[PDB]
Amino acid sequence: VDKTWLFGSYAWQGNPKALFLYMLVNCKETHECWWVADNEESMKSIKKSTGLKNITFTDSEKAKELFPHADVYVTENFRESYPVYMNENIKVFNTWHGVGLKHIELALGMNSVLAESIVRKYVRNYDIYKNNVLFLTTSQAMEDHFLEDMAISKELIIRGKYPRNAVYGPNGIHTYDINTLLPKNKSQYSQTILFCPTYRIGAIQGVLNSLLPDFAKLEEVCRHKNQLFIVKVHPFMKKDNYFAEMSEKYKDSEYILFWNDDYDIYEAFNSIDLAIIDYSSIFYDLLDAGVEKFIRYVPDLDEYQNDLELIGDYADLTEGRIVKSFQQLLNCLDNANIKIISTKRKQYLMDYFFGFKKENKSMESLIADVDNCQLQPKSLKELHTFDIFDTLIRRSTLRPFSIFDYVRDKAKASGIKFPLALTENWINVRNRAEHDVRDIMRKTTFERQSDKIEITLDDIYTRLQKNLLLTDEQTDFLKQAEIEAEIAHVEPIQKRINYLFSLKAKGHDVAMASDMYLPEDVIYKMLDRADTRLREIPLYLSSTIGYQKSTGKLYQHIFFDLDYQYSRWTHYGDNKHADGSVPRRLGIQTAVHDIDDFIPFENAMVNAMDNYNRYPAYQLATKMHRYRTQLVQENGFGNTLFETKYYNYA
Amino acid sequence: YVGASFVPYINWAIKDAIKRGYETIYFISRDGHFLKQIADKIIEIRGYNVKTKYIYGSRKAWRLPSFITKVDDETFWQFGNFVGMDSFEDLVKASYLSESELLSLFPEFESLRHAKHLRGEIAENIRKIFKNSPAYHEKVLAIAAEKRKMVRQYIQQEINPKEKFAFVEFWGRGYTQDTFGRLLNDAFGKEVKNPFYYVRSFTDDMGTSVRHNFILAPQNFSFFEPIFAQTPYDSIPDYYEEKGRIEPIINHRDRSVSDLISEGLLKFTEDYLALNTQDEDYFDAALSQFNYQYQLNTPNDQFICNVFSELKDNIGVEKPYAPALTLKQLESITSKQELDKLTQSIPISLSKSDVKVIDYYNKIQKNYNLPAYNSTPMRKAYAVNPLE
Amino acid sequence: QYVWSTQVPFRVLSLKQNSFYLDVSFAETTKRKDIFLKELNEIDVIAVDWLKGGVPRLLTEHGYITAHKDWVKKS
Ligand SMILES: [Zn+2]
């Protein structure tokens, strides 16, 4: 053998499985084909059900042997993880899991319920996606749609047929005998009907209950007509207890069969005489498998089409007699001869969706287009985002509350009379007001019709002024004092700034992502006072955007705002959660360092002071911290020398 | 305890209202009984120039009529009327329609009988389908315009609009105030500024609703609802008319608890306005900060355990707020829902329960996914033994 | 017992099989399990980040590694 192909997916299904079987049969001499399951039990199940021996599992020593020098990796999805030992030049043949007219992948955007998973996938594996994925397209319309919705290379497209819709034909491949699953042989029914409902938005009754409320009358009708009614629901619909109830009720039913999902229904497409479909892509699959009788059981047409935004018109790009009521569905099943799709109509739909099928395509043609493909990759840039406070810059008094102390110390001395509660208790007053505004934002997402929950300095001081009945003079004095103090206490963390600029000089993209309420111009003034160069670096400030790193939303906003083209994303920060856990959940490499902090003597010194003496104590404690920092991690002194010097000093 | 909780706040509010120029302060039903008693005592002693009046009302008596030209989308939100449904009766009641009047609109709803719990995504879909029906909107609007007659007349007869007035509550989101401001505008036919005094509220000023907050911190004061539920009559369900005059429906309760509570509160008002303070506003702020932080984070306190948590609260029958727990009661739970049914404060209830009960709760919590108990049993401090 | 330099970057040899950590804490949850620094391989150290307690961590393009002299060695 010369070439090596592995096939992977989360289940024994799809074009991966179809092509795997077809190659182990009709390509035993030119290719060595293996199927990598996700775990051991999956391999055991496949081997027990099929008897094949070319089945391994992920991270197996056989897999660690095959992946490093394989030739193709076939998949039905943009996998969430790829083997770290996968060869550099492998060809990821992504034979998608269906065609249709619904948006997918990057097109789902930041509002999608699946945003975090998409961001994780792409941040992790963008290099692979862009330089090693050969995406299978079936028509020019579908090719354009997929290229719009995904980040695939137009040069690596593969045009052809869906292996799962053309391999299990009458004389084709079958891993199981269909008659072993049916109460009677297929020939002993007048007609085989396949019910393929999708999962809906939401309804009081389960999808199956809304679509099939009375299974008893359905069985009566199907017995009258000697029809085999095969119920195949979306996996999410099976969680309903009504599904299990009606499944166990009709376990031995001769005319109602709840399809067992351990068997690939695609293998049985050639045995389906009628298909009751709604909004599932499988319809098109059926159309590609030769099925010609269709019933569109779409009672909730105006709750799905009016809701979702599609690329085309459902009624125009689908087929089947329209039906919107259970009673009319039964009337049709009893007294109706559903006619085959008109030749012109089938030509229309088949062009639109599987046009490239007319180019004399074949399985071997697909394998040839794959093998003869050439990877011409491009080296991609990396992304390096940086937290600001206590990462790129720090405070000359270390602790944030020192600032407030400073501000308080100015108020009481300005000559402007303030309320005692405000002066003496400024720390608690202001910090608790900030947290109050934050809770207000979090609790007013409906009233504001927005999920952004970040506050601004103006919000904090508005709360304070409107509920402490303060004059504009007092409020402006305090706010400007805080701003000027934050600016005047800035110090650079020079090593990380210089590392950021070395990265930028290497050609990488760098940016700043900070959670802070201060306005953007104040942040830029602080940065400029730390290092002027920093004024030229992109900035993602939460106050400006409304999303935060703590919730991970600011990272999603960065991903969808930039023309994300990076092979790696690294974020440098001090927060074990905002700058660590959360970004890691989004597939981002994190470098989380420790924040500056006092030790027992310095802390006790600061905690022992009242209002008059707390700020100079912050100054002296921070000088002690700077001294021990310099001694240990600048001068490189030993333990005894450092301890002697620090004692003698402090 | 209750004096520190209530009297400093009402002193702050009265002084702030005198400062803002308010001539009249209205105290709203239930929460305003004890608070108006306190305010009257403060005004008597300090000789302040400000009138106090009492107004009967509630969320139930004010929400439906407030739908002047539209049904609030909040009705279909996470904190709307369809939140907390447990049975079909709950759904029909939260719908404002009759059972048959409801099933006429939504025959699909006929399948909702005996639901066990009408919460979760089921309730989400229910709220959606309610929001999607214009017929429902217009029928609710008709019912609201009919029930609004008596409420408008009550407002017109009880509230002098030509004055500079304010309202004094204790805690809330601020949505009740918004509906009441809509009713005010409809009753006086103009943009009527209604300011509410709270201890705290979450929402900002919206429209004519103004909100003056005592404490500016993210604390939740629903904690003190048990006390106000000792007011000697139920929440006002609606109004009625007699002698050509509008009156609130008042179904009374026993007066013992509220009698003693008012005794204590007025003793505290006298003893609190008698303190030699250098700055009274700052002592208000300081005693309030300390007292709230104490009562909100001290579940093993003697008196928060033996008195407060024992107060009956319908929330719906007269059951304690956070009673002690027995071993078999915990043997009967498997979720946090079943335990919330037993108490409104797991920490306080556990601090009152036997050591074996606490140990059993610890044994079962990690699995049943119950909150972690991070307190110790309550130790009495004074009258530490039975005095009999 | 700690290998580090004030002058970054600098090359280090992995004496033993060294793991990568995405947090100076070296907590189990932050340890990468997809890849490690192979024994007898060299790697550039681009930063030295110190815990609050005064312990250095050597940052590489793949994450943090230890500075303990039994596990890394200046080239
Ligand atoms: Zn930071």
Automatic annotation (TrEMBL), chain C:
It is found in: Cell membrane. Residues 6-72 form the DUF5776 domain. It comes from the Bacteria. Belongs to the CDP-glycerol glycerophosphotransferase family. This is Bcs3. The chain holds residues 1041 to 1115 of 1215 of the full protein.
